């Protein structure tokens, strides 16, 4: 029932424009858990199967078997957005602690943070 | 010509759903400058005039006069998204260093980061 940071949901991202990531696809919850509990929206990063290897420092690979995916995928920490909770469809899986540490580092790079 | 982290642009955020922030409005560039230079997309946080005081730790106030706004506004670090660069319209202003430090801290809170 509770939406947790690091959960992976199916979500309809369309409509989008240009090079924005669209379609119905898995996304990872990256908003903090207090916002997850009490906000009407969540913040997510897109996951794609169209590539299967990290290409840049904002990319994090996720394996087909351990997570519940159609194919080896990659989390795009340069593709983030805020979604009303109604967009979230099936909960598919959730990332390991080690994986989320990779996501945190790519998110720090993506957003120009450093500490 | 170069899009810099901390710049404030007018951008068309619509269409949106539910409690997502929509409409044409100022947004602040929060993506790192390397992504700003070489990606087709930028990552932004929405600014609204519908409130004029920070309400939660993910809110950062910005003053009507120093920045070039219709009214005292607040940056919503819980309202972030990735936009194709074509969405960016007029460049309106850019945040001071001190202001961007406030934005960084709210972004760390919003995204569950800490370092």
């Amino acid at each position, epitope marked *: 029932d509770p939406i947790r940071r690091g959960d992976v949901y199916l979500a309809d991202l369309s409509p989008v424009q240009g090079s924005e990531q669209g379609g119905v696809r898995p996304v990872v919850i990256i908003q903090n858990d207090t916002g997850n509990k009490y906000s009407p929206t969540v913040i997510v990063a897109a996951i794609t199967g*169209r*590539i299967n*290897k*990290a*290409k*840049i*420092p904002t*990319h994090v690979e996720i394996e087909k078997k351990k997570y519940k995916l159609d194919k080896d995928s990659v989390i795009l920490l340069e593709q983030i957005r805020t979604l009303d909770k109604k967009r979230l469809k099936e909960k598919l899986t959730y990332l390991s602690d080690d994986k989320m540490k990779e996501v945190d580092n790519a998110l720090m790079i993506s957003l120009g943070l450093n500490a | 010509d170069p899009i810099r982290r901390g710049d404030v642009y007018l951008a068309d955020l619509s269409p949106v759903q539910g409690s997502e922030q929509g409409g044409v409005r100022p947004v602040v560039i929060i993506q790192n400058d*390397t*992504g700003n*230079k*070489y*990606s*087709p997309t930028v990552i932004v946080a929405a600014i609204t005039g519908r409130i004029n005081k920070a309400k939660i730790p993910t809110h950062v106030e910005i003053e009507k006069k120093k920045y070039k706004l219709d009214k005292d506004s607040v940056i919503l670090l819980e309202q972030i998204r990735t936009l194709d*660069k074509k969405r960016l319209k007029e460049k309106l202003t850019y945040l001071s260093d001190d202001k961007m430090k406030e934005v960084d801290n709210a972004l760390m809170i919003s995204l569950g980061l800490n370092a």
Partner: nanobody
Amino acid sequence: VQLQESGGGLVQPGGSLRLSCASAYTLDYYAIGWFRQAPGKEREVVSCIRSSDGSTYYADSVKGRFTISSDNAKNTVYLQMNSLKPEDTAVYYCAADSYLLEFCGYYSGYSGPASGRLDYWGQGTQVTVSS
């Protein structure tokens, strides 16, 4: 065959050469870059372009001497090389990937890959700058 370079050869120092990278696909499918490699060294970024917009990357060693450009009608990307130096001698490859221009920007800058992460590569063409 996907990418195919042509236009290498021998030039005296100070000369010019134009390399061509013929893409099997229209240039909106990916960004395209030129790399070079000398014996026993890793392939290094020279210049990159995303043809659908104008965006480019140039390595510090070739700035103001080399120019990358697109010919959409011929699905070809060119590297115009002027004021060539002996130290520009290398095998020159073109490469293509959806994320190539960001790759050029982030790593030239140099965290570290194997460069084999980019999807498409030509066979390489020899550039020799020598008197």
